[PDB]
Amino acid sequence: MNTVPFTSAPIEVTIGIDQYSFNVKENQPFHGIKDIPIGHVHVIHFQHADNSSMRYGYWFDCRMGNFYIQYDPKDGLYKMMEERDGAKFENIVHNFKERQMMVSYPKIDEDDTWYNLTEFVQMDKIRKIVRKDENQFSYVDSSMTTVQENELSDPAHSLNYTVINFKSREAIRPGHEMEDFLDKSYYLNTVMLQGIFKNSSNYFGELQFAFLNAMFFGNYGSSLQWHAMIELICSSATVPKHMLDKLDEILYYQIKTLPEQYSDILLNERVWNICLYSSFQKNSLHNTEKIMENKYPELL
Amino acid sequence: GAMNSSNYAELFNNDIKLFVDDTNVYRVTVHKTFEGNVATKAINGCIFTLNPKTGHLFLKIIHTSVWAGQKRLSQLAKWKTAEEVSALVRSLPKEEQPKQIIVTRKAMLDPLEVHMLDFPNIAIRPTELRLPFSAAMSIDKLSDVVMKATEPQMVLFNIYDDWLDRISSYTAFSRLTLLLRALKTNEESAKMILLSDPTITIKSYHLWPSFTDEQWITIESQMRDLILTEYGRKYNV
Numbered sequence: 001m002n003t004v005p006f007t008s009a010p011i012e013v014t015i016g017i018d019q020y021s022f023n024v025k026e027n028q029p030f031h032g033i034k035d036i037p038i039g040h041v042h043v044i045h046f047q048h049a050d051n052s053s054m055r056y057g058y059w060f061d062c063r064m065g066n067f068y069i070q071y072d073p074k075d076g077l078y079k080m081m082e083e084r085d086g087a088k089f090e091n092i093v094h095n096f097k098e099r100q101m102m103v104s105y106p107k108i109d110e111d112d113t114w115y116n117l118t119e120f121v122q123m124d125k126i127r128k129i130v131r132k133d134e135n136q137f138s139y140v141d142s143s144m145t146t147v148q149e150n151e152l153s154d155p156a157h158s159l160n161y162t163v164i165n166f167k168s169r170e171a172i173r174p175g176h177e178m179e180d181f182l183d184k185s186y187y188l189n190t191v192m193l194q195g196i197f198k199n200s201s202n203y204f205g206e207l208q209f210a211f212l213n214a215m216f217f218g219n220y221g222s223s224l225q226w227h228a229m230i231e232l233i234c235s236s237a238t239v240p241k242h243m244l245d246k247l248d249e250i251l252y253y254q255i256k257t258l259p260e261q262y263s264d265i266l267l268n269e270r271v272w273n274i275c276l277y278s279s280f281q282k283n284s285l286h287n288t289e290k291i292m293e294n295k296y297p298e299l300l
Numbered sequence: 301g302a303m304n305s306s307n308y309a310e311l312f313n314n315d316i317k318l319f320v321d322d323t324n325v326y327r328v329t330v331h332k333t334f335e336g337n338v339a340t341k342a343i344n345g346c347i348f349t350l351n352p353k354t355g356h357l358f359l360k361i362i363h364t365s366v367w368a369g370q371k372r373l374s375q376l377a378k379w380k381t382a383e384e385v386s387a388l389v390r391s392l393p394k395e396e397q398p399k400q401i402i403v404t405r406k407a408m409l410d411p412l413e414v415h416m417l418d419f420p421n422i423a424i425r426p427t428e429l430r431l432p433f434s435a436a437m438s439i440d441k442l443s444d445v446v447m448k449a450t451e452p453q454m455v456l457f458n459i460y461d462d463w464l465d466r467i468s469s470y471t472a473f474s475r476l477t478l479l480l481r482a483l484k485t486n487e488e489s490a491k492m493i494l495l496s497d498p499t500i501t502i503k504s505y506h507l508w509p510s511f512t513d514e515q516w517i518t519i520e521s522q523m524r525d526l527i528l529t530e531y532g533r534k535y536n537v
C-alpha cells in the first residue's frame with residue numbers, strides 16, 4: 001500500500017483523508033497516515049483547531065509519486081511535498097510504521113463509498129482545473145474563487161471549472177432563444193458534451209470534484225458548479241439513457257455522504273426542487289429523490 | 301439607493317430608457333361553447349414600448365395569427381414580446397438604442413435578457429413603480445389601430461401630443477400616468493371628463509384633447525377626484 005508521512009504535527013488540527021477525519025493535538029507524536037490503497041485519487045485536508053478559518057488540502061494520486069506533509073511555520077500551514085528519492089522514502093515509511101506513530105486507513109471493504117464518490121475524478125483533469133504544473137498534487141482551499149466568479153481576483157489561485165451560464169450566447173442559439181432556454185439539450189449535448197468534455201465521464205468527473213471541494217472545504221464556487229452541472233442535465237429534455245441512470249447513482253451517494261448538519265449550506269433548495277419535481281428528468285432520479293425525501297424533507 | 305424622488309426624477313436623465321409593458325399582448329374574450337363548455341377567442345393585442353423622456357411610443361401590433369397552432373400562449377406571449385423588443389432595438393441606429401429597458405412585469409426579465417444577449421451593455425430590469433399602462437387600450441385611437449389591423453404592424457405615436465412645448469417630461473409622464481390610472485379605474489367616467497366639452501377637440505395627429513394650460517389643471521383635478529372617489533367606493537371610506 002502507500003503511506004503519507006508527516007514530519008511532525010506542530011499545531012492542533014483536524015486532518016481528513018478521503019471521507020475519514022481524526023484530530024491531532026499540538027505537538028502530538030504523529031507521523032502520518034498508513035495503509036491507504038494506491039490505485040486512483042485521494043484528498044488530504046486540514047482545518048486548524050485554533051482557527052477554523054481556511055480549510056485547505058491537497059488532491060493526489062499515490063501512483064504519481066511519493067508524497068509527504070511538512071508544516072511550514074512561516075506560511076502557517078501543512079504543505080504537501082514530493083520526495084523524488086524513492087529509496088529514502090521507503091527507508092522512512094518502512095520505519096515510521098515500525099514506530100507506529102501513524103494512523104491507518106480502515107477499509108471495511110463492504111464500504112465502496114470513496115470509489116462511488118470519485119469514480120469519474122481523475123488527477124490529470126484536477127490539474128487542469130487547479131493549475132500548478134510544477135507539482136503533481138493540487139491545492140484547494142475554502143476561499144478559492146472560480147474563473148466564472150472572477151468574471152463578475154488572482155487568476156493563478158483560481159478554480160478553472162467549465163463556465164456554465166444559462167443566459168449566455170454559448171447556451172443560446174440565435175433564433176432558438178425560447179427553445180434553448182426552456183430546453184437546455186443543445187447546451188448540454190452539442191456545447192458541453194460534444195464540444196468541451198468529449199464524453200459524459202469527463203462531465204461527471206468535474207461534477208464529482210466540484211461536490212467534494214464544496215463538502216471538504218466549504219468552497220462556495222464549487223457548490224455553485226455542482227448545482228449548475230446537475231441543473232443543466234435535469235433541464236434538458238434529451239439526455240442519453242446511460243447518463244441519466246448514472247446521474248441517479250452519483251447523486252445518491254453524494255446525498256448519502258453529506259453531513260446532516262450541513263444541508264442549509266450545501267444544498268440549494270431552488271435547484272433541488274426543480275430537478276426532483278419540475279424538470280424534464282424528475283422521474284429519472286428515483287433513488288436520489290428517495291434519499292432526499294427521507295433524509296432532508298425540510299428542504300423540499 | 302431609494303429616494304423615490306431621485307429614482308423618479310432620474311427616469312428623465314439623458315440616458316435613453318424604454319418602458320416595456322406586455323399586459324395587452326395576448327388578449328382574449330371568454331364565451332360559452334355549444335356543448336356547454338367555455339372557450340377563449342384571441343383578439344389583436346399590442347406591445348407598449350415607451351420612451352418616458354420624449355413620449356415616443358413604439359406600438360407593435362400583435363395580430364391574432366401569431367397564436368395560430370401555438371401552445372402555452374401566456375408563456376409564448378412573453379417570448380414574442382421579447383423577440384419584438386429585441387428586433388426594435390436592432391432596427392434603431394446605435395445612438396438611439398436604449399441604455400436601460402424597464403419591464404413592468406418581472407416575468408418579462410428572462411425572456412428579454414435572453415433575446416438581448418447581443419446587447420450586453422443594455423441593462424434589463426423591473427420596477428417597483430406601479431404603472432397603469434395596461435389601460436393603453438382605453439385610448440381610442442390606439443385601440444382603433446390595434447383592432448383594425450389585419451397583419452403584424454408597428455405604429456409610432458407621441459403619447460404626449462405637443463405637451464413638451466410647454467411642460468417637462470417628468471410633468472407630462474405624471475399627466476400621462478394620471479390619465480391612464482383614471483381610465484383604468486373608471487374608464488367611462490374618465491372618458492366623459494375628457495370629451496364633455498365638444499368645443500375642445502382632438503387634433504387629427506394627437507391622442508388627447510387640445511386643452512389650454514388652465515383646462516389641463518381642471519382636467520387633472522377631475523381625474524384625481526375620480527380616482528379618490530373610486531377608492532372610497534371600493535373600501536367603504
Ligand SMILES: CC(=O)OCc1ccc(C(=O)O)cc1
Pocket residue numbers: 304305307308309311426427428429
Ligand atoms: C413616484 C414614485 O414614487 O416612485 C419612483 C420610482 C420608483 C422606481 C423607479 C424606477 O426607475 O424604477 C422610478 C421611480
